[PDB]
Amino acid sequence: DLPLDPLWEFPRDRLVLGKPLGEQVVRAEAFGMDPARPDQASTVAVKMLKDNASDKDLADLVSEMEVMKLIGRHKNIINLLGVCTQEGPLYVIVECAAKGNLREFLRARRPPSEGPLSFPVLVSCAYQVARGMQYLESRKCIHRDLAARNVLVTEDNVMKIADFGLARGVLPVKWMAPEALFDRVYTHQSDVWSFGILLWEIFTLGGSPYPGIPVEELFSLLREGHRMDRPPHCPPELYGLMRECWHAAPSQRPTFKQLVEALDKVLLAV
Numbered sequence: 001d002l003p004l005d006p007l008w009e010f011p012r013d014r015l016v017l018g019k020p021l022g023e024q025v026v027r028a029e030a031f032g033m034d035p036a037r038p039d040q041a042s043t044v045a046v047k048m049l050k051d052n053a054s055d056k057d058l059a060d061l062v063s064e065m066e067v068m069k070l071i072g073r074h075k076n077i078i079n080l081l082g083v084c085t086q087e088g089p090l091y092v093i094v095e096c097a098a099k100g101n102l103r104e105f106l107r108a109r110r111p112p113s114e115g116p117l118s119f120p121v122l123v124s125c126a127y128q129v130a131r132g133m134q135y136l137e138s139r140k141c142i143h144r145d146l147a148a149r150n151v152l153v154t155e156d157n158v159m160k161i162a163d164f165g166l167a168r169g170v171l172p173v174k175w176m177a178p179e180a181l182f183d184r185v186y187t188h189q190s191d192v193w194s195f196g197i198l199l200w201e202i203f204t205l206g207g208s209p210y211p212g213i214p215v216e217e218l219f220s221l222l223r224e225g226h227r228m229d230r231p232p233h234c235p236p237e238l239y240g241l242m243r244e245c246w247h248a249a250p251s252q253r254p255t256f257k258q259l260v261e262a263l264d265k266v267l268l269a270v
């Protein structure tokens with residue numbers, strides 16, 4: 001079936017599968033993800049197919065594995081760690097971020113008063129996602145569904161972009177740039193629009209975008225040149241970034257390079 005890639009194959013017998021994470025992806029213990037200390041265990045996540053999967057379902061998982069191999073590694077993406085391809089079911093092994101997705105992370109750290117999430121820390125979350133996206137962009141990866149739910153948080157509060165390698169497998173209208181919504185055109189610039197929405201998620205501590213506004217009314221609100229209002233405590237400089245991300249014309253929005261530089265300047269100024 002699948003060929004042995006010497007650069008990624010990991011011994012099936014050295015991975016002990018554990019609790020499911022959603023329906024399949026499973027929590028596992030891998031022994032020897034560090035070649036330096038190959039007795040050392042680490043917690044990872046394993047994507048595999050359920051028993052009623054078609055030949056097309058295999059093809060899609062192979063395709064995600066092969067795409068992640070080629071994009072390579074970065075501090076701010078969920079990285080490929082290894083694969084089990086031989087004499088058994090296909091396992092794709094990736095980093096497991098202990099604190100879950102950025103949405104639930106922020107929503108659980110909502111104060112009743114001041115909360116344990118400072119301005120610098122929130123800007124830091126935004127900067128780390130911009131760095132992640134600038135990398136994926138340099139590897140010619142268009143995400144297409146950048147949102148706080150698709151950003152995971154490690155034990156050391158590092159941001160890692162999830163699911164940047166999906167094929168055509170299971171819309172989030174509120175996060176989509178107009179050219180996506182209307183023309184089904186996805187570019188790096190349309191990802192910049194989604195970044196602007198994510199900025200707003202961060203500075204509402206995981207708020208739901210366009211509060212109360214049925215999806216039917218969003219399209220005509222955007223065509224009329226209306227956008228989400230500045231969130232309660234959001235400094236203007238940050239709202240200004242969000243707005244730039246929400247320019248109708250894609251060529252008018254910032255590049256991920258410019259977002260990294262802008263957020264860098266805010267953190268240096270602190």
Ligand SMILES: *CCC(=O)Nc1cc(F)cc(Cl)c1Nc1ncc(OCc2c(Cl)c(OC)cc(OC)c2Cl)cn1
Pocket residue numbers: 021025027043044045046047064065078079092094095096097098099100101152161162163164165
């Ligand atoms: C690590 C321990 C743990 O339980 N972590 C939890 C717990 C939880 F309730 C929610 C989450 Cl999101 C996590 N973290 C976590 N879950 C899954 C995960 O990997 C899934 C995955 C991703 Cl994000 C990507 O993106 C590149 C690809 C693949 O497979 C190709 C998978 Cl399986 C990471 N962290």
